[PDB]
């Protein structure tokens, strides 16, 4: 009867009184699995509802006038902006830490580290550290290939040496994904067609230094594919990671469904890919082998984050249900071995991530 994975419902934001109309991309944020921040318009009064995942039942509501609110991934520190005006408060200390008035409006922005906020304007991307007296630093100018796109994501590798800005647009009656991969070291940026992606550190056997992988999924005109490539120059003395490419399946019912999120577990070296309409896929980071695939949400998903505790992924859907899928450690090997009849991959993962099956 078994399953690779291990599904679980954490919450039903509606049972907390959140208007289903605020359970969406632009009003509900989940910069980590420690908080969920919803902006509601209770009366003629705008306010933010912070939900402490360790105390769901006690959401706290605060009057705000920001067009966007994003919570720090680890502390009750919140980024609030209104146009070109950007402020950052430490809710518990009820104080304004640091403040900055951009010269252009910020169309997207998301924490990328425990201390840095990324800001995307129509024509550039900035990083802004909370470490001391800092200010925003322009990282790179936006490529014309995303001009017009709706910015939906921004990701970085562990050493913030590679930056991914992802946008989407309605072209040819299908959502096409436009990505911009910038190389901090080489000051050059490459256009890519993609919907979702994530970076990952991986230590190839026979290599002393980890390798910086860049994985992205896309439903291009040639259908859906998933790529896993090493980005940048292999550390001196390392072998280069051989680029992988596989097909990501879409059933006939899923007509306009596409990749919407990706999280990678360095713990099991597995890629979690969730489609816009609730499909979840599990691939081997190393080989790119598809280990499992099946539906986990009937309502579309619009936001996820790594689920630290289980090393999986945890997102929210339009219904307000907080979902989370992770590797079912006790039974991921047998599954692969017996259900997928792939001894090799099974034997490899057992030994590689130190599992048992």
């Amino acid at each position: 009867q078994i399953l690779p994975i291990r599904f679980q419902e954490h919450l039903q934001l509606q049972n907390l009184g959140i208007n289903p109309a605020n359970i969406g991309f632009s009003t509900l944020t989940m910069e980590s699995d420690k908080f969920i921040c919803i902006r509601e318009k209770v009366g003629e009064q705008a306010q933010v509802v912070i939900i402490d995942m360790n105390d769901p039942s006690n959401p706290i509501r605060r009057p705000i006038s920001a067009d966007s609110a994003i919570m720090n991934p680890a502390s009750k520190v919140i980024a609030l902006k209104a146009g070109k005006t950007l402020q950052i408060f430490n809710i518990e200390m009820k104080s304004k830490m640091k403040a900055h008035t951009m010269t252009d409006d910020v169309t997207f922005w998301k924490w990328i580290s425990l201390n840095t906020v990324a800001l995307v304007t129509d024509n550039a991307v900035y990083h802004w550290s909370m470490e001391g007296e800092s200010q925003p630093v322009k990282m790179f100018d936006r490529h014309s290939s995303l001009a017009g796109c709706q910015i939906i994501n921004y990701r970085t590798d562990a050493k913030q040496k590679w930056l991914l800005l992802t946008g989407i647009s309605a072209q040819q009656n299908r959502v096409v994904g436009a990505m911009q991969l910038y190389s901090v070291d080489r000051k050059v940026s490459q256009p890519i067609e993609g919907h979702a992606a994530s970076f990952a550190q991986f230590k190839m056997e026979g290599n002393a230094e980890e390798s910086t992988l860049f994985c992205f999924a896309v439903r291009g005109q040639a259908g859906g594919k998933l790529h896993i490539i090493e980005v940048g120059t292999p550390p001196t003395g390392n072998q280069p990671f051989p680029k992988k490419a596989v097909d990501v399946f879409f059933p006939p019912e899923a007509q306009n469904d596409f990749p919407v999120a990706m999280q990678i577990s360095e713990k099991h070296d597995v890629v979690f890919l969730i489609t816009k309409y609730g499909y979840i896929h599990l691939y081997d980071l190393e080989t790119g082998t598809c280990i499992y695939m099946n539906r986990i949400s009937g309502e579309t998903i619009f936001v996820t984050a790594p689920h630290e505790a289980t090393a999986g992924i945890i997102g929210v859907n339009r219904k307000g249900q907080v979902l989370s899928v992770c590797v079912e450690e006790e039974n991921i090997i047998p599954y692969i071995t017996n259900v997928l009849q792939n001894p090799d991959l099974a034997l490899r993962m057992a030994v590689r991530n130190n599992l048992a099956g």
């Binding site: 933010v48 920001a66 609030l80 902006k81 209104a82 402020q87 408060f89």
Partner: peptide
């Protein structure tokens, strides 16, 4: 100048 979130 001003504050974008009124604290308790």
């Amino acid at each position: 100048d001003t504050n974008l979130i009124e604290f308790e």
